[PDB]
Subunit: 110 residues, 5 copies
């Protein structure tokens, strides 16, 4: 269970998540828990999406929209992703810090 953190900002409107192939030995995903505003964040709506492929096209999932004047935080409940993953901001300058865990589910044939 590795510990992971990243940031989505105006230089990082698109971020790519890819765990190292070694952890792919025990079948691996990414579990996400918290998202918080950065120190350079502006007072606007910051729309973070989780992005993968659906129907062969780039599918985006609006997860949160952080704003200092409404709610600059998010607690990510039950969100588990298959690497590679994309994190996007369709609007906003950031930074928005993403915190999660590189989780590797153990062999379970029960």
């Amino acid at each position: 269970s590795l510990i992971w953190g990243c940031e989505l900002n105006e230089q990082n409107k698109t971020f790519e998540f890819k765990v190292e192939d070694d952890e792919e030995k025990c079948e691996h995903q990414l579990a996400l828990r918290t998202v918080c505003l950065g120190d350079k964040a502006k007072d606007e709506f910051h729309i973070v999406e989780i992005v993968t492929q659906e129907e062969g096209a780039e599918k985006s999932v609006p997860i949160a929209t952080l704003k200092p004047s409404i709610l600059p935080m998010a607690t990510m409940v039950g969100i588990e992703l298959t690497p590679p993953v994309t994190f996007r901001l369709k609007a906003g300058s950031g930074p928005l810090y993403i915190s999660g865990q590189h989780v590797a589910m153990e062999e379970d044939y029960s």
Copy 2:
């Protein structure tokens, strides 16, 4: 586990959820997690309901009422629906983005 997203707006006061019949092979429902305001949303109360049939009549379930000045967001906990489903706005212009998963429960005779 397909990934689903839609929007309820003033052109989409009523939205119809129907998964493709193929996923009906392994018995299927829709699990919902998050709802967020759209970029064209206005500052008013936006009442989203989940709608099915009860007693033979159209039964609505007020789920959320999003408003930028009070709470423009909702985290949908433990909400699982049987397709076809209806999503309604009894008031509001939208858009309000709905995010969930096409979940298909596996055969479990335990």
Copy 3:
């Protein structure tokens, strides 16, 4: 699993929940999920209680206090009641919409 909704207002300061005796065949309770402000709700504190009998007297349990200016909503987590049940407003004009399910636990002798 029947779907249930009611409203506590100034004409409905006390509401009585009683499921039909047929669902009493498979042992039955009421599970509650969400509560939202009504369209005629005023800007005041609306104190909803779940009421049953304790020590032989009318026992009330303050569950929520909805107000448009503080928090007009509630997400009811882990609340399961034995019918008949009473829902009360010790203050407020309403309406406050209550959403839940008539749940009937199946025979489980494990």
Copy 4:
């Protein structure tokens, strides 16, 4: 599963929880769910603690700090206490209503 409610106020800065010895037959604790402001509550920070003995000294656990202007409510998740218990206000006038259940875990030797 008895139903319990109390209030911490300026006359009740310290409250003592003690279930009757009869329920001690089946091994008993107290599970807490919700806390709400009283009707006589003032606009200040009301710091409620759960208090027991640690290292032989009076140990307090700040659980919540209710205030009408910030957040007058709390939903107590996963809080289970061994009677006798103390509930304290290190600041505030109250009342603050505490709601929970006298829970008695059944014999389970599995």
Copy 5:
């Protein structure tokens, strides 16, 4: 299951968690539940992180950012740490009270 509480303040920008070696007999971690503002807390952003070693370097995990004017509280869900642990404030004067349990998982070879 020992009960633990600490505070991160301007004299305690860095706090070290280390359980006594005796509890290391039954394999031990720290489970965290609540965080609340101190009585001497100021109106600023107080960024608490959980810190351990990753890639051989000091890795920090922004957990919360408490502020009286936005949200002075946090409910820590599903957070379990391996002692020794570090708790940091990258900004803020504190105090910020951390509440948790010294939990020791029992032998389970199932």
